[PDB]
Design goal:
It is classed as hydrolase. By secondary structure, this protein is α/β, with parallel strands linked by helices. Helix content is about 35%, strand content about 20%.
């Protein structure tokens, strides 16, 4: 039976990361929507006009709003894409057969939206992002924070198991992004009733140097998932370093 995978990229990246995974899932007979979130990929918005996490996630929500009455989707969220999964799961829990997180913080409906970030930024050193750079933007009375990935950070910490071509593509395509911390600090947390009704799966990427496996495991341990798979030699960009494995894990989880 044909599944519809909605793939959601992490911060500063775009739908294009899925360019290897998407045709694989399609050759398996499945439908795939790879979404650019707002001001990501070639989405035509600018980051300095995106101030809320809901606005950032809107292209995903639009895909969710368009799932027909008798269909569901399988979501796959990479990295920060996992937060947009949570929003999709809180909003349209009945529309999702399983929400798959990969190298992603899985929201915990027991805690605030910022909790996984508060956690990340307690367990991880302050210089972890190397040559990446941050700057504020938006309302001076309540500024957003944007970031740009450094090419050493990308090379060493995100794409180190990927081809040079994929890293090249990332250097050519990465755009400023934001984690919307201060907007997330004022959201409405997800609920166990809604977000928590949705089957969760985790795909571990064991060589992820950006979101290390021990931290992936901590999210799975503390939050829980119904299915877990591991890709031993996936880096942070498992859909580019190990697209076939991601495709097998996904079909496994979904079928």
């Amino acid at each position: 039976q044909q599944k519809h995978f909605v793939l959601v990229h992490g911060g500063c990246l775009g739908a294009w990361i899925w360019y290897k995974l998407k045709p694989l899932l399609e050759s398996a007979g499945h439908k795939v929507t790879a979404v650019d979130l707002s001001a990501a990929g070639i989405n035509p918005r600018r980051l300095d006009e995106i101030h809320t996490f809901r606005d950032y996630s809107e292209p995903l929500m639009e895909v969710m709003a368009s799932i027909p009455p008798d269909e569901k989707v399988v979501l796959l969220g990479h990295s920060f894409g996992g937060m947009s999964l949570g929003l999709a799961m809180e909003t349209y829990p009945e529309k999702i057969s399983v929400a798959v997180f990969m190298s992603a913080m899985m929201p915990d409906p027991n805690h605030s939206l910022t909790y996984p970030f508060e956690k990340y930024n307690e367990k991880c050193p302050a210089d972890m992002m190397l040559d990446s750079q941050f700057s504020t933007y938006g309302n001076p009375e309540n500024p957003g924070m944007s970031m740009i990935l450094g090419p050493q950070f990308m090379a060493l910490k995100m794409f180190q198991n990927c081809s040079v071509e994929d890293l090249e593509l990332a250097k050519m395509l990465t755009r400023p992004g934001s984690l919307f911390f201060q907007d997330l600090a004022k959201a409405k947390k997800f609920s166990t009733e809604r977000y928590g009704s949705v089957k969760r799966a985790y795909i571990f990427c064991n060589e992820d140097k950006s979101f290390p496996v021990e931290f992936q495991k901590w999210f799975v341990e503390s939050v829980g998932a119904d299915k877990v798979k591991e890709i031993k030699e996936a880096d942070h960009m498992g859909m580019l370093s190990q697209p076939r494995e991601v495709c097998k894990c996904l079909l496994d989880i979904s079928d």
